[PDB]
A paper describes a structure:
V/A-[name] is a motor protein that shares a common rotary catalytic mechanism with FoF1 ATP synthase. The V1 domain of Tth V/A-[name] (A3B3D1F1) is an ATP-driven rotary motor where the central DF shaft rotates inside the hexameric A3B3 containing three catalytic sites, each composed of an AB dimer. When powered by ATP hydrolysis, the V1 domain rotates the central rotor against the A3B3 hexamer, composed of three catalytic AB dimers adopting different conformations (ABopen, ABsemi, and ABclosed). Here, we report the atomic models of 18 catalytic intermediates of the V1 domain of V/A-[name] under different reaction conditions, determined by single particle cryo-EM.
The three AB dimers in the V1 domain adopted open (ABopen), semi-closed (ABsemi), and closed (ABclosed) states, respectively. The Vnucfree in the ground state is activated by the binding of ATP to the catalytic sites. When ATP binds to Vnucfree, which is in a stable initial state (ground state), the enzyme transits into the steady-state for ATP hydrolysis (upper row).
Residue numbers in the entry:
A (entry chain K): 81 to 120
B (entry chain G): 169 to 209
C (entry chain D): 5 to 474
D (entry chain L): 61 to 188
E (entry chain B): 1 to 578
F (entry chain A): 194 to 578
G (entry chain F): 161 to 472
C-alpha cells in the first residue's frame, strides 16, 4: 500500500545521492575542459 | 429531388462566381501595387 | 556574434533589414529591442538588396534606431534525447514542467527526410485501443493513418485522452508470448485553450500515464508560427524514437483545423495568392508531408501509427480540410452528434466509420479468427435494426414479423451496451464476448455472414458481466 | 506501481540538472576572474583579431576603458578609430564599415552559444 | 555551360540572377549542394528557377549552373525488371546508397555503367543508316533488346564495334562524320516520338476477362477509364490484365498515390505474379512509382515519363500496355503548380489548360508503324477516382470525351460476392463497330448478333427488376420467370469469373462464344417448352444446367468436345421436353 | 499578470431558465451569442446584465445604436440590485461607442473594457463582461486595412484577425490575484454576421475558442418566442464539471432530470423528420404523446417573458421543479397509454392549465404550488384507473 | 411610395389617450430624393400639394437624369435642415428618403474609382460607417420638444433579405417594415405581411396610460395564430385538406380572414379603437381556451364580438 511508496522514496534519495556523489568527484576536469574549448 | 438538385447547383455556381471575382480582384490589386512600388523603386 | 541594424520598415508581422546576406533562407533570428526584450522571428526572404523578417510576436515596442537583429541558427532544428519521456514542451522546444533543459544526443532538422518507398512493408499487427467499437469494427493497425472526425460540441479531447492512457499491444495474442516491445505516446496540442490545457494536465497526471508520455502544448493566444512548428517537432521526435530505439509510437494530433487556419493566415501574410476556398493551393502537399511520414519499414522493429483529430467545420465532409484528409488517410471514424445528445459515450457512429487496412489486421496469429465475420454481421444487423426502428414509428410493432422485433431489441441492446462503454477499459476478448452475446439475441441461421463452426462454438452465451460488473 | 519510477526518474534528472548548472556557475566564475591574471592581453588580442577577420572593412574597434594598453597598437595599425565603452566586459565590439552592422565578441557570448554543444561532452565526462 | 550565382531567394523553389545564355525550360543544378531546378521565366540577364526540393538552408551567392537540356529520360538496355521514381531514378540503388531516407541533393545514373552486355552488330562500315533503323541486338531477360538509331540522326557508318561484350557507355557505332552512337540515348519528355504513319484500331486487345472482351471490347491502342471505389479490388483486375493480356510489355505508373501503395504494387508484382510462360512476371515489367510526399514536379512529370518509355518500347517492335494508376492526384499536382505560378483558376481551382494536357497525353497511345518499318501499339487504361463518386467533376468530363471505353466499378457489386465487379449497365465501348469485321472473320459470322442478343437479354432483365421486388419473384408469370432465371444464369455463369484459379483466370474468345451459344440454345429450348406447357420448375432441374454452368473450369483443348457434347445434351433435353 | 489559473467549478447565473439549465456557463467561462438582426440581442444582453450574480458588470457597446444605451442610462437608476438592493447603476459601468462615432475607437473601447474588467477582478470581485458586438470590431480592422493597402485574407479580413480575437477572449478566467485573492471575469460575446451567415470566418474562429455557444434563429423570432434560442444548434461544454456543485446546491438528481429533458427533445427532433412528410395523424398515439410533450416543454419551460414583472427573473430551483413535474406527467402519460388509453383525452386533462400557468408564480410561493401540482398530477392518472 | 405618402398624410399623435399636450400641430414633412423617376415625383408632388401641407414641407428633389455624385449630398443636407429645425424651434419633423439603392450605387462607384477594399458584392467596406453617419442623425433630445423621425425607403433587388444594403440597415435601424409580393398579386393593399415585420421600440409605445393596456397580449396572440395558420398552409400543401382536423380548419379560417380583412384596408384611415375591435372580433373565432397568452379579465370584458357587427 504505502510501504511500496516508502521504499520508492528511499531508493529515490538513494539514486539522487549516488548521482550527486558520483558527479562531485568529476568536476575539476570538466571545468578545465570547458574553459579550454570556450577560450580560443 | 430534381428541384433540390437544381437549387443546389444554382447556389454552387453563384458562390463559385463570387470566389472567382474576388480572387481576380486580389491578383489585380497585388499586381498594380507591385508595379507602382517598383516604378517608385 | 554578427548584429544587423538598419531597420527600414515595420508593418504588422513583417519588417525589413538590409545587408543580411549571411542569413540563409528560413533561418531563425532574435530581436533585441529598446527595452532589451528578446523576441523571435524567422527570415522568409533574402536578397542582395535586403532581407525580410516575419515576427511571430507582438510589435508594440519597436523602432528604427534601438532595435537590433541577430542570428541564432541556420535552420530551425530540435535537440532530442531519450530521457525526454515524462517532460512537457511549449511547442518550440522549451520545457515547461519546471525541470532543467535536457541534454541533446543529436540535433535534427524538424522537416524530416521522406521515406524511400521500397523500405516500407505491409502492416500486419493491430493495437488494442481499449474502445470496443474501435477494437471490433474499425480495428486500428500499426503504421496506419487513422483520423477521427469530430463535431462542434462533441468531446474529442476526452476520447483522445482515454485512447492515450489505455493504449497497449497484445504480444500474447500473437505468437510473441511475452512482453518485450517498448511503447510510448507522442501527444501534440495545437490551438488549445486554458480549459483544455488544465484538463489534459489532470488526465495525464492522475492515472499515471505521464511517465510513458510526451506532450507538446501550445495555447491558442500563443503565436501562430509556433503552432506551425509544433506538429513537425512531434513527428521528428516520434521518428527518431521509433527508428533508433525500436519503440512503437502512437502519435496524436489534437487539431488539424487550427493548424490549417494558422497556415492560411501565415501564407496570406506573405502576400501569396490563395487557391480553392481561399486556402493555399499547396495545403494538400503540406498535409501529406505531415501525415505521410509514418509507417513501418524493413529490417527495423519500429512502427509509427498516427491518429490526427480534426473537427469538421460545420459537420460537413465536403470542406477542403476533411476532403484532403480523406484523400491522404485510409478511412475515418465519424462521430455522431445524435448519440452524444442521447447520453451515450463515446458517440461513435458505426454506420459511416470505416477502415482500409483492417482486412489484413484481423485473423489468427494476429487476433482470433472470428473478428471479420462478426464485424460484418454486426454492421448489417445494426443497419437493419435502425431501418426497422424508423419503420415502427409509423407501422407499429404489432404489424411486424418476428425478425423485425428481434432486430429492434438487438439494436437497442447494442447501442445501450456495446457503444456505451463509458470510462471503463475493455480488452479485445471482452468485446468479442459481448458481441457474441448480443448476436445471441438474434435467432440462429440469420447470421448468413458467419460460418457454422463459429456459431456452434460460441452461440448461446448471453449478456452476463456487463450488468453485473463494471 | 508506476508513479514510483516516474518520481525516481524526475529526481535523477533534476539532480543531474542541478549538477550541470553548478558546473556552468563554476565556468562563469573561472571566466569572470580572468582579467587579474596577466593572460588578459592574450585573450583580448585573440578576440580582437577574430572579430576583425570576421568583419571585413571594420571602421572601429570598440573596447573597454581599461583595455586600451593591450589592443591600442593593433587597432591603430589596422587603420580604425577605436573608442572606449563601459559595456562589453570580457570582449571587444567590432563595427562594420557602413555603420549599419557590428559584431560583439564578449566571452560570455561564446560561452552561452557553445553551451548546448558542450552539454554532451560535459555529461559524458561527468558520468561516462 | 552557363554559370551564375543566386540573387533573390524569395521563398520556396524560387531563384533569380543573371544567367544571360540560359534558354527556356532547362534542367538546372542549383547551389553548391546541386539541387535540381527548372527555368520558367527569362528576363534580361536574370532568370527564374523553380526547385523540386524545398530551398530551405540556401543563401545568396551560391553558384547556379544550367545543363543546357530540357527534362529527358535515358532510354537504353537494363530498364526492365527495374523500379524508378517520378523523375526516373533507381530506388533500390538509392536505398543501398543513402539509406532508408531520400536525402536531398543525391546524384544517381538511371542506367548502371558497370554491367556488360553482349553486343551484336548489324551493319558494316560504309552503309547508310538513318534514324529509326535497327543497329544492334542485346538479350535482356529472355528476349532481345534491340538498338535503335536516334530519331534525329542520319549518316553513313565509319566503323562498328566488334561483337565482344561492353558496358552502356561504350560507343558501338561511329558515323562517317565522326559522331559516336552510344548504346543508349535521351529524349525530351514533352515531345512525342516521330512516327511514319498512324493506323486504325482494326484489331482487338485481348484483356482476358469475358465481360471486358465481349461486352466492352478495347482495340489495340485504345483508351479505357475505370472509377476507383474502395473494396472493388482494382488491384485484382489490374494484376489480371497485366499478366493475362496479349501485351508483350507491361508498364505500371503511379503518381501521387496514397502512403500504403507498396502493399500491393511492390510485393505481388515481383513475386506473386507469374506470366503464362516463365518464372516471375517482373522480368518483363517496368514501374514508375511516386508516393504522395514526393516533390510535385515528379508527380506531374511521371505520366510523360511513362508514356515516353511506352513510345520507346512501341518503336522497339513490341506491344505495350500502359496503366496510369490515378489521374485525380495528377490534377491535384497540376493545381498546386498553378497556385505556384499564380494563373487564375477556371473551375474548382483547376487551370484552364487541363483538357489540353489530358488530350496531349491520351493521344500518344495508338497502333502505328515504326520508323524501322515494324508494327507496334501502345494501349492505355487510365484510372480516375472521383472525389466523392460523382462524374460531374471536370477531370471526369475531360476524360469521358476522349476515352473509347469507360468500364464501371462498384463496391456494392463485390458486396454480393460477384467478381469481377464490372457494372454491365453504365459501361460503353466505341470499338464495337470497327471490330465487328475481324470478329466475324475470326470467331463467328453471327458473333455480333449473339452479342446483341445477350445485350437485349440483359436490358430486358434490367427492365423487370422493380415489378419483381415490389410484388415478389415467385408470383410472376412463366415467361417472366423464365427470363429472370436465364438472366440470372447468364450473369452468374458467363459474366462472372474467378481470377485466382488456374483454369478460370484466362479465357479465349471461342470459349466464351461457345458458352454463349450453349446458353442461347438452352434459352430457345426453354422458351419452346414453356410455350408448349412445361412449367419453369422442370426447367430448373434439367440435367443440362449443372453441366453448362460448370463449363467455366474446363481447359481450352477439351472445349470443342465438351461444347459439342453439351449441344447434343441440349438437343436430347428438348426431346425429353417435347 | 496573474498568479495561477484555476479550473472553473461554479456556474454563472443568468436569470433565464433555458440558459441557466440546458446550457450553463461557468464563473470564468466565455459564451458567444451570434445571430441576425431582429433576434433580440439587445433584450438578451440587458437581461443578462440586470439579473446576473456577479458584483460588478462591465458593459461594452462596441459600435451599436445609442438609443439602447440611453434606455439603459435612464432605466437602471430605477431598479434595485437583486443582491444588495441599491440602485443597479452603482454596480454597473458602461462603455459607450455609438455607430456614428469615429471608426478607430471601437478597438480602444473593447480593450479599455477588458482591462477595467481585469482590474476589478484583481480587486477581488466577480466581473461579467458584455461585449455587445465583435463584427463591428472586425469591420473597423478591415477598414484600417483598406487604406493601409495590405494583402487581405479571406473575405477582405486582415490575416491577424484570428490572433486578435484569441488574445481578446483569452484574458478571461478564474485566477488568484497577486495579493492571493480569488476573482474571475466572465465574457458574453455577441456576433453580428452579415445576413445571418453562421459560416462566416469570425464566427468559425469563435467556435474554435469559446467553451459555450448559443444561437438564435429567424423562425422563432417571427413567432416572438423569446429567448429564441435555436436549441438544435447550441451546445455547452461546462455541463460535465458542474455536477457536484449542482448536487450540493440544488438537487442530487437534477443533472439526470436535465439529461432526460435533453433526451426527450432529441427524440422529438428525430421524429420531426417523419412528421414533416406524413403528418401527425398517421402516427401512433404514443408518438403523438412525445410530440405534445415536446410542445409543452417548448412553450412552458423554455419560453420566458422578458417583460413580465414576475417571470423576468427565475431561480434554478423553480426550473428544476418545473422539469420534475413535466417529466413525471410525461411518464404517467406513457403508463396510461400503456393501458389502452388514447391521447385525445390526455390533451383535454385540466391539469395542463396549471402546468402552463405555473411559471408566473412568485419565487417564494412556488413550493406550495409545486406540491399541489404533484398531488393533482398523481390523482389525474391514478383516479381514472 | 403610396404607403409613405399616406402615412405622412394621416400621421398624428393621440394625446387624448394620454392627456399631455393639446396642440396637435401637424408634422413638418421633409422630402429628400435620390434618382427619383418622373412618374413617382409627379405622384408625390400632386399628393403633397393636395394635402394642403406644402406650405410647411421642404422638398429636396434629385431626379434620375441628374448627375450621379449629387446623390451623396442631398440626404446630408436634408438631415441637417431637419435637425436644425427640430432642435432650434421644436418643430415635429418627419423625414422621407426616396431611395437608398441609388445612394449605394453612387457610394460604390466613388469607392471603386478610388479602388478601396470592397465588401460582399463590391460595396465599400466603410459603408456601415457611412450609413451610420446618416441614420443616427435622428431621434429626440432631452429637454426639448423637437423630434426627428426617419422613414427611409429602400428596394431589395431580388426580393432578398441577405443583400448587404438591407442587412446593414437592419443592423443599424430599430426594426423595419417589409412588404410581400404574394399578397400584392392577390389584390391586397397594403401588402404588409406581419410576420417578418418588427419594431424594437414597441414596448415603450404601449401599456396602461398610453393607448390601452391590452395591446401587447392582442399583438402576440395575433402573431401566434398567424404563424400557426402559415404552418398549416405548408402542411396542407402536401397532406391536402381532407385529413385536416376541426381546429386546423379553424386556424386556416382565422388566417385567411385575417389576411382578407385586417391587412386589406383600401386606403381608408382607421383609429386604434377600430383596429382593436376588429382584432377582438377576429380573435373571437378561436376557442376561448387557446388564448394562453391573454389574461382572463381582458377576455371576459372584450371577447365574443362577431365580425358582421363591424360591417355588413
Amino acid at each position: 500500500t504505502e510501504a511500496l511508496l516508502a521504499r520508492y522514496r528511499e531508493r529515490a534519495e538513494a539514486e539522487a545521492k549516488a548521482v550527486r556523489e558520483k558527479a562531485m568527484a568529476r568536476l575539476d576536469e570538466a571545468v578545465a575542459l570547458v574553459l579550454k574549448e570556450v577560450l580560443p | 429531388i430534381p428541384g433540390i438538385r437544381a437549387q443546389i447547383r444554382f447556389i454552387q455556381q453563384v458562390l463559385e462566381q463570387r470566389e472567382r471575382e474576388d480572387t481576380f480582384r486580389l491578383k489585380r490589386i497585388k499586381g498594380k501595387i507591385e508595379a507602382r512600388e517598383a516604378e517608385e523603386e | 556574434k554578427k548584429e544587423y541594424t538598419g531597420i527600414t520598415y515595420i508593418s504588422g508581422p513583417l519588417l525589413f533589414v538590409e545587408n543580411a546576406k549571411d542569413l540563409a533562407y528560413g533561418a531563425i533570428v532574435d530581436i533585441k529591442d529598446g527595452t532589451g526584450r528578446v523576441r523571435g522571428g524567422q527570415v522568409i526572404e533574402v536578397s542582395e538588396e535586403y532581407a525580410v523578417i516575419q515576427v511571430f510576436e507582438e510589435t508594440t515596442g519597436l523602432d528604427l534606431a534601438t532595435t537590433s537583429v541577430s542570428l541564432v541558427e541556420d535552420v530551425a532544428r530540435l535537440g532530442v534525447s531519450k530521457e525526454m519521456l515524462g517532460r512537457r514542451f511549449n511547442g518550440i522546444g522549451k520545457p515547461i514542467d519546471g525541470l532543467p533543459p535536457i541534454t541533446p544526443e543529436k540535433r535534427l532538422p524538424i522537416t524530416g527526410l521522406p521515406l524511400n518507398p521500397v523500405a516500407r512493408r505491409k502492416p500486419e499487427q493491430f493495437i488494442q485501443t481499449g474502445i470496443s467499437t474501435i477494437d471490433v469494427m474499425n480495428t486500428l493497425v500499426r503504421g496506419q493513418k487513422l483520423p477521427i472526425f469530430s463535431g462542434s460540441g462533441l468531446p474529442a479531447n476526452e476520447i483522445a485522452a482515454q485512447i492515450a492512457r489505455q493504449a497497449t499491444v497484445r504480444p500474447d495474442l500473437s505468437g510473441e508470448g511475452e512482453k518485450e516491445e517498448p511503447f510510448a505516446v507522442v501527444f501534440a496540442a495545437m490551438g488549445i485553450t486554458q480549459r483544455e490545457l488544465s484538463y489534459f494536465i489532470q488526465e495525464f497526471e492522475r492515472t499515471g500515464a505521464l511517465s510513458r508520455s510526451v506532450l507538446f502544448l501550445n495555447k491558442a493566444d500563443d503565436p501562430t508560427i509556433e503552432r506551425i512548428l509544433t506538429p513537425r517537432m512531434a513527428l521528428t521526435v516520434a521518428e527518431y524514437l521509433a527508428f533508433e530505439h525500436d519503440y512503437h509510437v502512437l502519435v496524436i494530433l489534437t487539431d488539424m483545423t487550427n493548424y490549417c487556419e494558422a497556415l492560411r493566415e501565415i501564407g496570406a501574410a506573405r502576400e501569396e495568392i490563395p487557391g480553392r476556398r481561399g486556402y493555399p493551393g499547396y495545403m494538400y502537399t503540406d498535409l501529406a508531408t505531415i501525415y505521410e511520414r509514418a509507417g513501418v519499414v524493413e529490417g527495423k522493429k519500429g512502427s509509427v501509427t498516427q491518429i490526427p483529430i480534426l473537427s469538421m467545420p460545420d459537420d460537413d465532409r465536403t470542406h477542403p480540410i476533411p476532403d484532403l484528409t480523406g484523400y491522404i488517410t485510409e478511412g475515418q471514424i465519424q462521430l455522431s452528434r445524435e448519440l452524444h445528445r442521447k447520453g451515450i459515450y463515446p458517440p461513435i457512429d458505426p454506420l459511416p466509420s470505416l477502415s482500409r487496412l483492417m482486412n489484413n489486421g484481423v485473423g489468427k496469429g494476429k487476433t482470433r479468427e472470428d473478428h471479420k465475420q462478426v464485424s460484418d454481421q454486426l454492421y448489417s444487423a445494426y443497419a437493419n435494426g435502425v431501418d426497422i426502428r424508423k419503420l415502427v414509428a409509423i407501422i407499429g410493432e404489432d404489424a411486424l414479423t418476428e425478425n423485425d422485433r428481434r432486430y429492434l431489441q438487438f439494436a437497442d441492446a447494442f447501442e445501450r451496451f456495446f457503444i456505451n462503454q463509458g470510462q471503463q477499459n475493455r480488452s479485445i476478448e471482452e468485446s468479442l464476448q459481448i458481441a457474441w452475446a448480443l448476436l445471441s439475441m438474434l435467432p440462429q441461421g440469420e447470421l448468413k455472414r458467419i460460418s457454422k463452426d463459429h456459431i456452434g462454438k460460441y452461440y448461446g452465451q448471453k449478456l452476463e458481466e456487463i450488468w453485473g460488473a463494471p | 506501481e508506476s508513479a514510483g519510477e516516474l518520481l525516481v526518474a524526475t529526481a535523477r534528472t533534476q539532480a543531474r540538472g542541478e549538477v550541470l548548472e553548478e558546473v556552468r556557475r563554476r565556468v562563469r566564475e573561472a571566466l569572470e576572474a580572468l582579467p587579474q591574471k596577466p593572460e588578459w592581453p592574450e585573450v583580448v588580442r585573440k578576440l580582437a583579431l577574430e572579430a576583425l577577420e570576421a568583419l571585413p572593412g571594420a571602421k572601429a574597434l570598440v573596447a573597454n576603458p581599461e583595455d586600451l594598453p593591450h589592443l591600442e597598437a593593433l587597432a591603430r595599425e589596422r587603420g580604425v578609430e577605436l573608442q572606449a565603452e563601459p559595456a562589453l566586459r570580457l570582449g571587444v565590439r567590432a563595427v562594420g564599415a557602413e555603420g549599419k552592422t557590428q559584431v560583439e565578441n564578449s566571452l560570455l557570448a561564446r560561452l552561452d552559444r557553445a553551451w548546448d554543444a558542450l552539454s554532451s561532452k560535459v555529461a559524458q565526462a561527468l558520468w561516462g | 555551360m552557363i554559370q551564375g550565382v543566386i540573387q533573390k531567394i524569395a521563398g520556396p523553389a524560387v531563384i533569380a540572377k543573371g544567367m544571360l545564355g540560359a534558354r527556356m525550360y532547362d534542367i538546372c543544378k542549383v547551389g553548391e549542394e546541386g539541387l535540381v531546378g527548372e527555368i520558367i521565366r527569362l528576363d534580361g540577364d536574370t532568370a527564374f528557377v523553380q526547385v523540386y526540393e524545398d530551398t530551405s538552408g540556401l543563401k545568396v551567392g551560391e553558384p547556379v549552373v544550367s545543363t543546357g537540356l530540357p527534362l529527358a529520360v535515358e532510354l537504353g538496355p537494363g530498364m526492365l525488371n527495374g523500379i524508378y521514381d517520378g523523375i526516373q531514378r533507381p530506388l533500390e540503388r538509392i536505398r543501398e546508397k543513402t539509406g532508408i531516407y531520400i536525402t536531398r541533393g543525391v546524384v544517381v545514373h538511371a542506367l548502371d555503367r558497370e554491367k556488360k552486355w553482349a553486343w551484336t552488330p548489324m551493319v558494316k562500315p560504309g552503309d547508310e543508316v538513318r534514324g529509326g533503323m535497327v543497329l544492334g541486338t542485346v538479350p535482356e531477360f529472355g528476349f532481345t533488346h534491340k538498338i535503335l538509331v536516334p530519331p534525329d540522326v542520319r549518316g553513313r557508318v565509319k566503323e562498328v564495334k566488334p561483337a565482344g561484350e561492353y558496358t552502356v557507355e561504350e560507343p558501338v557505332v561511329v558515323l562517317e562524320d565522326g559522331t559516336e552512337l552510344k548504346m543508349y540515348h535521351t529524349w525530351p519528355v514533352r515531345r512525342a516520338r516521330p512516327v511514319q504513319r498512324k493506323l486504325d484500331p482494326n484489331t482487338p486487345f485481348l484483356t482476358g476477362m469475358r465481360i471486358l472482351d465481349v461486352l466492352f471490347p478495347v482495340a489495340m491502342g485504345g483508351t479505357a477509364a475505370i472509377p476507383g471505389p474502395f473494396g472493388a479490388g482494382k488491384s485484382v483486375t489490374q494484376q489480371s490484365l497485366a499478366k493475362w493480356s496479349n501485351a508483350d510489355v507491361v508498364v505500371y505508373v503511379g503518381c501521387g498515390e496514397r502512403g500504403n501503395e507498396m502493399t500491393d504494387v511492390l510485393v505481388e508484382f515481383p513475386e506473386l505474379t507469374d506470366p503464362k510462360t516463365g518464372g516471375p512476371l517482373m522480368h518483363r515489367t517496368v514501374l514508375i512509382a511516386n508516393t504522395s510526399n514526393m516533390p510535385v514536379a515528379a508527380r506531374e512529370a511521371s505520366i510523360y515519363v511513362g508514356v515516353t518509355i511506352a513510345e520507346y518500347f512501341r518503336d522497339q517492335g513490341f506491344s505495350v500496355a500502359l496503366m496510369a494508376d490515378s489521374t485525380s492526384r495528377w490534377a491535384e499536382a497540376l493545381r498546386e503548380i498553378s497556385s505556384r505560378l499564380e494563373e487564375m483558376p477556371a473551375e474548382e481551382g483547376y487551370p484552364p489548360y487541363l483538357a489540353a494536357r489530358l488530350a496531349a497525353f491520351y493521344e500518344r497511345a495508338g497502333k502505328v508503324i515504326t520508323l524501322g518499318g515494324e508494327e507496334g501499339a501502345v494501349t492505355i487504361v487510365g484510372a480516375v477516382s472521383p472525389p466523392g463518386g460523382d462524374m460531374s467533376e471536370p477531370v471526369t468530363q475531360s476524360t469521358l470525351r476522349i476515352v473509347g471505353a469507360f468500364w464501371r466499378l462498384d463496391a456494392s457489386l463485390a458486396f454480393r460476392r460477384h467478381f469481377p465487379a464490372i457494372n454491365w449497365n453504365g459501361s460503353y465501348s466505341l470499338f464495337t463497330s470497327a471490330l465487328d469485321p475481324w470478329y466475324r472473320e475470326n470467331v463467328a459470322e453471327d458473333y455480333p448478333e449473339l452479342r446483341d442478343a445477350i445485350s437485349e437479354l440483359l436490358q430486358r432483365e434490367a427492365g423487370l427488376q422493380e415489378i419483381v421486388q415490389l410484388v415478389g419473384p415467385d408470383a410472376l408469370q412463366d415467361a417472366e420467370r423464365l427470363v429472370i432465371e436465364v438472366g440470372r444464369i447468364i450473369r452468374e455463369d458467363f459474366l462472372q469469373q474467378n481470377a485466382y484459379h488456374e483454369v478460370d483466370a484466362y479465357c479465349s474468345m471461342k470459349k466464351a462464344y461457345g458458352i454463349m451459344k450453349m446458353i442461347l440454345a438452352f434459352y430457345k429450348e426453354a422458351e419452346a417448352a414453356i410455350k408448349r406447357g412445361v412449367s419453369i420448375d422442370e426447367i430448373l432441374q434439367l440435367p443440362v444446367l449443372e453441366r453448362i454452368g460448370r463449363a467455366r473450369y474446363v481447359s481450352e483443348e477439351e472445349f470443342p468436345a465438351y461444347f459439342e457434347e453439351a449441344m447434343k445434351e441440349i438437343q436430347g433435353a428438348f426431346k425429353a421436353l417435347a
